[PDB]
Amino acid sequence: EIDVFCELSYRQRAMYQSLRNQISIMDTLMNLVMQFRKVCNHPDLFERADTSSPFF
DNA sequence: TAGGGAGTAATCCCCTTGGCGGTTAAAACGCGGGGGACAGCGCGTACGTGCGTTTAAGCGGTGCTAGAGCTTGCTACGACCAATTGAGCGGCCTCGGCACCGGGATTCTCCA
């Protein structure tokens, strides 16, 4: 059994920390631990990156 | 303090919608002609209008008594529930009613 640690990429931690900011109001925690598990898997699960352009 | 509710996502059965293909039967298209729609016409009779008659509907009034509408008293009966079972539902089976076919017989139409 080999443990393989890797840190949250800058996009993931932008998701994770703004999500964790909800703990300043709630604590829904069982909802948050599923959103935290999504971003810990891939942020496209939480918000799919897609072709984008400036504000019109 | 603990139990069971709230949240959520994976798991897997059920089932309704949609497409493909053919093919085949019914809808679409054409056209002749017929006969039924419909306009135009004549008559006559049947219905609206008017006037004098009558008839009885409607309003004001009197008297009566039935019976609608309310109060009281009580017990009968249907709501209620715990215990018992058998009537009636869901699943499975099969055979016989009925349909669908084919071909020969009787009916009905339409033109002569």
Which technique was the structure solved with, according to the deposited record? cryo-EM
Q: Determine the Cα–Cα distance for residues A23 and A55; give it in Å rounded to an integer.
A: 31
DSSP assignment of A14-50: HHHHHHHGGGGT---HHHHHHHHHHHTT-HHHHS---
Residue A25: both structure tokens together: 């109001």
CB A21 within 8 A of CB A45: no
Provide, in whole angstroms, the distance separating residue A54's CA from nucleotide B61's C1'. Answer: 99
Q: Determine the Cα–Cα distance for residues A27 and A19; give it in Å rounded to an integer.
A: 13
Least Cα distance to A23 among A14, A32, A34 occurs for: A32
For this experimental structure, what is the resolution in angstroms?
Answer: 2.8
Distances (CA, A) of A36 to A21, A40, A54: 12, 6, 29
CB A8 within 8 A of CB A42: no
CB A19 within 8 A of CB A35: yes
Residue position matching structure tokens 């890797």: A6
A49 Cβ within 7 A of any nucleic strand B atom: no
